Amino acid sequence: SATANSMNAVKDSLQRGQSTIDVALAAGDTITDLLGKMKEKALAASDTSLNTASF
Amino acid sequence: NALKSDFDSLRDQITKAASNAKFNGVSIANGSTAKLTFLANSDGSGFTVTAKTL
Numbered sequence: 001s002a003t004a005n006s007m008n009a010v011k012d013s014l015q016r017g018q019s020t021i022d023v024a025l026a027a028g029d030t031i032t033d034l035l036g037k038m039k040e041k042a043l044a045a046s047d048t049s050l051n052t053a054s055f
Numbered sequence: 056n057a058l059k060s061d062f063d064s065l066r067d068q069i070t071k072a073a074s075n076a077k078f079n080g081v082s083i084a085n086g087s088t089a090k091l092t093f094l095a096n097s098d099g100s101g102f103t104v105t106a107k108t109l
Contacts (some may be wrong), residue, residue: 008073040096043097046094046099047093048091049091051079051081
């Protein structure tokens with residue numbers, strides 16, 4: 001019975017881990033969007049027909 | 056002499072026209088560069104255009 005009761009703490013820990021990963025995935029959506037925009041910036045800047053102000 | 060004077064004035068207008076052939080500071084015809092390279096794909100591979108000096 002004591003062994004069965006201690007599984008409540010195990011469940012609490014696993015749910016805490018799922019919450020931590022949820023916050024990391026929410027940050028990762030922001031980071032992958034930012035990286036796609038930065039790739040578009042570097043791709044546009046590699047063109048040599050741009051003037052200095054656009055670069 | 057009148058024909059020669061007209062000829063020289065038209066020759067100077069050619070220099071004016073060639074020097075003004077620019078689009079936002081870049082030109083493919085005023086002789087300032089040998090080629091322009093425009094983007095062809097997302098990796099950054101180029102689409103070259105050879106310059107044609109005028």
